[PDB]
UniProtKB/Swiss-Prot annotation:
Subcellular compartments: Nucleus
Tissues in which the protein is found: Expressed in brain, heart, kidney, liver, pancreas, placenta and skeletal muscle.
Top-level taxon of origin: Eukaryota
UniProt lineage: Eukaryota, Metazoa, Chordata, Craniata, Vertebrata
Function: May be required for DNA interstrand cross-link repair. Also required for checkpoint mediated cell cycle arrest in early prophase in response to mitotic spindle poisons. Possesses beta-lactamase activity, catalyzing the hydrolysis of penicillin G and nitrocefin. Exhibits no activity towards other beta-lactam antibiotic classes including cephalosporins (cefotaxime) and carbapenems (imipenem).
Assembly, per entry: Binds constitutively to TP53BP1. Binds CDC27, which is itself a component of the anaphase promoting complex (APC). Binds PIAS1.
Coiled coil spans: none
Family membership noted in the UniProt record: Belongs to the DNA repair metallo-beta-lactamase (DRMBL) family.
This protein's name: DNA cross-link repair 1A protein
Induction profile: During mitosis. The mRNA encoding this protein contains an internal ribosome entry site (IRES) in its 5'-UTR. This 5'-UTR generally suppresses translation while specifically promoting expression during mitosis, when cap-dependent translation may be impaired.
Organism: Homo sapiens (Human)
Amino acid sequence: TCPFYKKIPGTGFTVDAFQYGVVEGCTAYFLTHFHSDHYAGLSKHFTFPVYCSEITGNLLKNKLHVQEQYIHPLPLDTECIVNGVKVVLLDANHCPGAVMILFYLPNGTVILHTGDFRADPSMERSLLADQKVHMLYLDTTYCSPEYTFPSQQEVIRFAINTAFEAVTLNPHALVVCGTYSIGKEKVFLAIADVLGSKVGMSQEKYKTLQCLNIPEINSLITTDMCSSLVHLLPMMQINFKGLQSHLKKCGGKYNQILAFRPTGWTHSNKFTRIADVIPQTKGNISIYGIPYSEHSSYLEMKRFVQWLKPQKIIPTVNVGTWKSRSTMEKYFREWKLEAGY
Ligand code: NI
């Protein structure tokens, strides 16, 4: 059964609610982004209207074979009417195609559903600036002050400089980047750009990236592994055994691997600066964990909410334990008292 925090009151609508069968009274199913915990349950047999971004729509049609007649793509930053209700999709600064959804209820209530997001001051000048929001359904993934991490730009600087140094010292080194979902494409595209290479990958991953409207993509990616010195591999294979095995397959073209695992937060964040990050090394293999996040830090989240001043907050992440829920509610109250709303 569908949990309450996936239902939008006063509407026929649900958000990211595809794993519960036919939801009673739902007339339109919104999908914020193509990540499996959110799309879980969609397939070619789905016959209700799905509302989403253009990019999410390309992925539904090509990867899950959802039929075209049930895919309803909406442009961003544009007022649209869905089953009698005005909605707007906003960029979520998450993965490609990820959106936040503004609903304008017929009684005058305005609701923002963030989906998954990385809050940014640039959001304070979107169509959110133009009216009051009463209820916020908030991505609280990292809602605790221990969660600090650098900007995406600092992380990419670290990765480009690390890769360019290693390959210039040893032109026979291979760079490998882990992946298991869409998102974080900048990691492998930035590194391939500094090295003058295309990114090589499986046919299935090439297909996925071809759905993303990224400019000049035919110029940056390929299925010909032999022509490429940046390879993408499943995240599970980014370990010493998996990488040793891959190096064997390259036919003596390379004699060293430098590999990157973009994680979210890890507790090495509480002690160490990005400058000071070091790899794990075994023989001719080194592995870097880099803290490239597509979710808000605690401070980014706090800034957004204190700017928005919602009347009520409904968390959508970490809702399963009483300790988590109590912790989150304490921070929301602090934020409200400090800012004065
Ligand atoms: Ni996500």
